[PDB]
Design a protein around this nucleic acid. Sequence first.
DNA 1: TGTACAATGGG
Length: 178
Amino acid sequence: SDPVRQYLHEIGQVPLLTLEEEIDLARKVEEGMEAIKKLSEATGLDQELIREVVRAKILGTARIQKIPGLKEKPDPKTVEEVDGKLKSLPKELKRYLHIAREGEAARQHLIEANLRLVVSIAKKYTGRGLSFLDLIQEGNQGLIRAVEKFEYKRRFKFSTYATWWIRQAINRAIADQA
DNA sequence: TGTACAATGGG
Ligand SMILES: [K+]
Ligand SMILES: [K+]
Ligand SMILES: [K+]
Ligand SMILES: [K+]
């Protein structure tokens, strides 16, 4: 270990979610995107933009800030313009901005939870022409993809689905080595 | 446009 001892130490803190926690969050995230859809529908902005803005706002309340493989930013002006157009929106909407806020907050917490998983899985793949942290970034990137596509009402534990994407991720990764 | 038993020190 090195300056990544710091990372592991950062994540080892975050306690695992119980099942009911997992669900409630996953509901919030799902509901968040649904809102963000209605919002993209009214303000005719990109759905992925709107989120990205909302996320960069509530990223303040996050338990982990510098997460490998995840995508930072974006830009304070667009944040500013977009949020401007958003907050200034009508009052009957309002509710939707709250939900969208909650969802993205959820997603952040969810991902924070599962960072320990990515690391445990990642260990399995050392010695394949990626340095540890590479794995961790690819790992995290899969985990983010995982949360994106996860449907909770399938009654499967998150770790199962997450594991699949975390492995798909690192596997495709080392395949792009050739 | 679909990817799913659980898995978060390991076995
Ligand atoms: K022991
Ligand atoms: K022991
Ligand atoms: K033991
Ligand atoms: K044991």
